[PDB]
Structure formats: C-alpha cells, structure tokens
C-alpha cells in the first residue's frame, strides 16, 4: 500500500532563512552550533535565564545538546513568540516538531 506524504505546516519553514543567516553568524561547526554559541545568543535576546532554559529544552528536539539550523530556528522562533508578548504552551505538536524528528511507527 502506497502511503501518502504527511506534510504538516511547520511554520518555522517561513522563519528558517533568517535564523539560517543568524546560525551562520554564530560560526556553525560541522553544520551545528554548540550550547555556548546559542547561549550567548540567548542572553543577547535579553530574556530571563529561566525562559532560555525552557526555550532550549523544547527547541532541542534531538536532546543532543547542540542546535542545528532547524533546532536553532525553533529556538529563535520560540524566543520571538515570547517577545511578541506570548508564550509557548510547553507542547511540541506535529506543526512544531520538525520532520527530521517525526516518529513513524
């Protein structure tokens, strides 16, 4: 049975180009920045340290400790949501979880 492609609306796909540029300015080592790079970026965002921890713990879907361009873009996306006056529901739904981390079966 030929199953179809599940294309969910990952809004970060609209955000990506901008955070991709930022990702490159933090010096992406082997295509993935370390916790230090994004840590100083997060403190530049001028958010409370508690928020940084929450943003990271949600955004880092790999639980790898590093942020690649999609994880980092989610990090920035969530930070922006906070800056917009709102907050993240502490839920990663299908339309926020990147396809790279979408578990099939």
């Amino acid at each position: 049975g030929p199953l179809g492609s599940d294309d969910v609306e990952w809004v970060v796909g609209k955000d990506k180009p901008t955070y991709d540029e930022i990702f490159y300015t933090l010096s992406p080592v082997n295509g993935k920045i370390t916790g230090a790079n994004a840590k100083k970026e997060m403190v530049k965002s001028k958010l409370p340290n508690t928020v940084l921890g929450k943003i990271w713990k949600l955004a880092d879907v790999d639980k790898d400790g590093l942020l690649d361009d999609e994880e980092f873009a989610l990090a920035n996306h969530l930070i922006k949501v906070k800056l917009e006056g709102h907050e993240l529901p502490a839920d990663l739904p299908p339309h926020l979880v990147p396809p790279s981390k979408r578990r099939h079966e």
Partner: peptide, 15 residues
Amino acid sequence: LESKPYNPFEEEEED
C-alpha cells in the same frame, strides 16, 4: 536523570 545536562541554561543550580 531529571537534571537535564543538555541545557546550557540548566548547567548546575547552586552547587
């Protein structure tokens, strides 16, 4: 295992 060491904003609390 509850202290998540993968977060640079969660790197140790008081000690």
